[PDB]
Amino acid sequence: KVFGRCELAAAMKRHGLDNYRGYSLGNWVCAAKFESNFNTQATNRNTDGSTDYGILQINSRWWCNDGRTPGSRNLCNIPCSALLSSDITASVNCAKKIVSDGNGMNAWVAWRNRCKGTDVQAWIRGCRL
């Protein structure tokens, strides 16, 4: 599923991401935009052979199992395929664990490079929440 901007903001808000660990809603939407272009089915392979999955491009190196990343962890305890669902619940619950692990949203390279220190509120302007 390819979310609309405000559709995703609303879904994210409903799943408890607004100001989660102090990150306003605009940050999560900005991150999703530049990680996946709002596509729940986005996958991308990394050089070390791990793969990033779904709307927030969660990495099989640490966070999920895809059966093909030898010596990796599965810290969210889910098949990576569950991160591709049109239901973003699994992605959100796993992201909550990632953002809590000490490094905040810096875990998402695109957020660090394209959202951090910008006016992220513009990403939810006009939306009915």
Binding-site members for substrate are 101
Contact 89, 14 (CB under 8 A): no
Indicate the residue among 32 and 78 with the shorter CB distance to Cl ion.
Answer: 32
Q: Based on the shown chain and the rule CB under 5 A, indicate whether residue 104 belongs to the binding site for Cl ion.
A: yes
Which among 9-17, 34-42, 74-82, 86-94 is the span making contact with Na ion, rule CB under 5 A? 74-82
Residue 24: CB minimum distance to Cl ion, A: 12
Contact 13, 20 (CB under 8 A): no
Q: Rg of the chain over CA atoms, in angstroms?
A: 14
> H/E element holding 98?
helix 89-99
| Residue 72 binds which entry of Na ion, Cl ion, none, CB below 5-8 Å type-dependent | Na ion
